[PDB]
């Protein structure tokens, strides 16, 4: 086998749209907003803090 180094990471679509989404009910997060994050029309916070 071989490989391809992706310059940006990529959500595996089986784990995104298996219905129920494993990423979806893993993050406690609805699938619609996760696809709005992944397809680059929304931002989601990481370590909001103060």
């Amino acid at each position: 086998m071989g490989h391809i180094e992706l310059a940006s990471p990529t959500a595996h679509i089986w784990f995104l749209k298996s219905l129920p989404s494993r990423i979806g009910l893993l993050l406690d997060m609805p699938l619609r907003d996760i696809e709005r994050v992944l397809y680059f029309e929304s931002y989601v916070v990481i370590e909001g803090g103060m």
Partner: protein, 50 residues
């Protein structure tokens, strides 16, 4: 492998891998050249979808 002629009976997987590699190479060149925000967003979006 070719069918009987001068042309290759191409496979769909090589189309998919060729699409992924072309988009990833374009994305490496744009991250090198410091393209603006929306251009590299579209580039990572097309890479995600490919």
């Amino acid at each position: 492998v070719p069918l009987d002629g001068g042309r290759f009976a191409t496979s769909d997987l090589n189309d998919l891998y060729r699409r992924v590699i072309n988009r990833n190479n374009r994305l490496k060149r744009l991250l090198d050249l410091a393209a603006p925000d929306i251009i590299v967003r579209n580039e990572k979006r097309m890479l995600q979808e490919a």
